[PDB]
């Protein structure tokens, strides 16, 4: 058994230098690599176990000099499988993917960061090893920047980060899966520890192999597309499993870094630095399975497990808080709970009082278990908390009372965690975002109007519509009955409305609007909300998604503001929702970042303006949902004065794992957040040159030219999408929740921008991120020679700009022309070939293009580690990559015959039995979806 | 300092004995050690205090960990004085002599602590010291190496306090911790046997328990087996808190497990 | 019950069908699910209380300075209309919830259970008119 040689020194030339000399990467993933191929030796034979090495040698011999030879050998050994085969080596190669994230994780999250790297300015902001922990962030703002300490405190006193979770947008990794992971980490990590015994090294090896094979001998298929309640609790996995614990050890963090700077004073417990938000079970835009019961439950589901996580915690409490010195209020609060009910003593005040909220939160958790369950409940409102005022009074009595007696302390100790908890993570967890289309709600009112016999709302221009929403807003007349002709859709509103009015606000952040354009779908929302008698309404959130919304958003704003009952409804607060992606898909990457960046400049004019305090909501795409390091710079280079101590961004599902499955990571995450909101607050970036805005608006003319002439202009391009890609297959598999198209016969308009990215991501080409970027650099270069100068100043010194090409530069990273030419080769037709030929000519020249702006002669030159770590991930992506393509040959082609090889080895006893009521030939289906999760998986973000 | 852990009492077994490693094992399979727990002779000391005194010793420990960070080091020694004082600032008297199931619970407080997950701990490593000598079986689970008794509920020589009725109580107290522990293992039990090959009888068994019944799917089949253990923990710790709380109950004997062998059974 | 009439009747039994059969079919018939039938009963001026609380809150006048046929006239174009007439956000004396609040208990309950509305103090169209829409609109 000397395979291990061989790989092992496939790895070393994958890996060749040292980024550190913690860099045991290659020893961790040679680790893991040996003890699964071992498994699969055991499990599926020894020839199984040899091609599937000799495969991954090859892929890793191409990620290491890229010569074609290497893919048509890949190929040649994965057409002669029969499905059965394809199943395990597809199956294998996904673990195996897995494994080098888990090392990677291990890996970064066990790097001691080098203080001597940092350079001075903001580029170090870009990367973990040379990033601000809270503790240089604030040595930075007082040295730097000459803030006094106390600036320091109130700047955080006030500031607000709110995350917010959506679904995933495919596998939302088993929960099981997920703690089998978590298992093999910390095997790994205790494995390296540099003094364990013999027997607890050789018990801590069967416990890993034991996991690996634990976690391959599980199924990733079958059953439903887990309705969205499932997704739901698949998304509160990351409370038990990091936030719920991770919040208060943070905040503890943020009052030692405050002393050890000369604030005495801690954060206060009701001060929220932290919130979270949720869209699993709001979210409708495009999405049917999301029905007006699917809020309500996962609104229930949410109380639940608040109500379930403080009754888990107040038992510790109540054994912490064994004291008898105690203040006279909570003396005679402790008689009177007495009075009115181990048996908890009157000489333990702080437990009777505990003890009360115990019986509270029981009989919460109990009621919303009914709630759920049934549809009523017997339990009185008085049993229950209803607001977090109720369940906040009594502990900030105790709080008082032991501070009072100067056990301060104590009180600093299990009741200050808790206390911060219940202020962090209220009733709820989290608070549900509700989105909807706009047209649903003109749908709605057009109804109305014409039942009314008042006209068609729809044909009334923009200003007509604002004029009788105002008037019908300030009339004291309802608006209708349950006598109107509702479709499907119109109900669906309107019951989600009824749906928002019975349940508490607690559980409900804000109303967003997609496909958002002018301040008549904001009003008609409002209207809508106060006629279905939603007793608190809403924050109302517009999300400008094309182009042209961007260009007009800020004088919707304003307009909405210079209305009275707008400006006195919203209370000088207003949240706007942008979509980099959304952008993106409508006019290509680099007009959609540099809109944004204009266009949150205008907002902020205009709430100046107005005395309003804007929120910008950042969707998913952006530049601030890479996750890790690169955060960090992103936040700091939105325009100054668009953050302001309220930060809101979405945590993509795709990331939430990096963002919150260990303790060093959930950590880091609430760290670079609060910091780079902190910073960014008190030290906006530049203020860009003029010439710099006049380059960007030419190269935005100039890229959108070219995007939309390739994806729109171009008849045969939709041809094409449907061909060298696999987005009809995920159109139509039990991967996500959500239809691909919003109009089933639409081009690329109807599309979504998900399946548009995850389409072109799936085949190593990420057309839709980099394309525009050569026909603009090229366009300007040719212009002046000069301008090439000036690009390379923005990079090394405008924060904005760097942070955009350094994206693009990663996910030139993580493509490669050849993979999807093997794409072309088997799946689209001859005389589409030159078009494909010429876009990759495209790719290549923007690559040449980026690399001469950012200063670079390879790929992410400044960053080797995410260079290694990308490079370790790809050798396992590209025999995914291949495979896929050869299943879709075999899907869409019955009558391309393969030569078969002999099957390898071992109601359901084999590998190929696991779908049954299968479309396709016997395995195909499950290969394909195999390798769309683990490329999926391998490449992770990219725009 | 100087005794002789498993491992090298083995080694002395066999080397200079001239003891089979064969004749150990079986040796171990036949031996039950009887730990027998009586009450505290003065001061069984509060199950708070207990904890307290645990938060004391992990930050002295982690305190004097070789690489710990300036913040760490900084939050323990204030999580050391704050559990400090919180140990000085509460009483040890009062009340009563506490009640005969008080002292009981105040027992059973170190199977929480460290009994419960320490048996299977240890009996891993006696499996592992049998490796290290060439016996590639580990100890049968059913072996009784290890064996727990009480005397705090049951004995009453020179104590009228402890009436049939105190030992009623101590009965199902314990039934009732044992049966929550189950329960509260079983869960993550359920998660890690997500497979999906099985055997034969466990599929037939597995098609019989769906039937008769998240909502455990039958590809998942040790779930299911295990899902419904954890039924029957369930009703069995409610039965035993009806009975103890009351005298009586409704839930019947055969929603539960009423012998071992019921339950080592799936 | 009907069904076993029917039967009984079949088989030549009708002697038998006519003796308890019979007896209880009538008593079903007479006695209905709830042996009475409520009938409510209400002065005229509370409606008119209740329609001018509306008009004023509605900034369209008084209802009850308005003159019979202008009352007969509001009260139809309201009649015809799609758009119900309040809400919550109602300034209620005492009284005017005491009828509103009965009209919704009438609206909660079996028809089974009520005969008339009897308006006392009739006089005018309009208070039989005012009734009708008051029913309408509480649903």
Redesign the interface.
Known sequence: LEKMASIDVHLRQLVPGKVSEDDKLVEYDALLLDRFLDILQDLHGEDLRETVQELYEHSAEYEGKHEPKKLEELGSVLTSLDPGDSIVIAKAFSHMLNLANLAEEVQIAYRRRIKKLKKGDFVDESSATTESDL?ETFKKLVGDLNKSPEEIFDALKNQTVDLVLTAHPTQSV????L??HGRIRDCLAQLYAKDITP?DK??LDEALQREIQ?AF???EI??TPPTPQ?EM?AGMSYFHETIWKGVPKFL??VD??L??IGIEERVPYNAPLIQFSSWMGGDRDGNPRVTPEVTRDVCLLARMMAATMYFNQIEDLM??M????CNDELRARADEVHANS?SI?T?EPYRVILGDVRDKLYHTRERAHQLLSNGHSDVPVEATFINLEQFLEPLELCYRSLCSCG?R??A??SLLDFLRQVSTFGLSLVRLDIRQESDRHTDVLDAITT???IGSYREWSEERRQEWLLSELSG????????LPKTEEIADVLDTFHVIAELPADSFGAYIISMATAPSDVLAVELLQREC?VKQPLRVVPLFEKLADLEAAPAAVARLFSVDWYKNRINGKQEVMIGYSDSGKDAGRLSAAWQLYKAQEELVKVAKEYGVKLTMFHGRGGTVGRGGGPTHLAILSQPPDTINGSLRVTVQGEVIEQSFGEEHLCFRTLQRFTAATLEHGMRPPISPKPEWRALLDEMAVVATEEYRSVVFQEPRFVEYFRLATPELEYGRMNIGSRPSKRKPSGGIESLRAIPWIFAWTQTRFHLPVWLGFGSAIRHVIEKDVRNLHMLQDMYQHWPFFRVTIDLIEMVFAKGDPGIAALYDKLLVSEELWPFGEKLRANFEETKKLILQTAGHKDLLEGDPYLKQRLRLRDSYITTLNVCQAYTLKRIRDPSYHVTLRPHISKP??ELIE?NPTSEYAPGLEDTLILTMKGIAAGLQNTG
Request: net charge positive; charged share 50%.
């Open positions: 503790e088993r929960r099981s899966l703690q089998k027997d050789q018990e634990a001998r599980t199924d079958k059953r499932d609790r503890r963090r030692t870094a002393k050890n054994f912490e064994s004291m008898w010195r181990k003593p000489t056990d302390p104590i600093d100790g039942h009314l016999d004291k007349r309802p608006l209708f009955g349950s006598d008698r359901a006893k696991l």
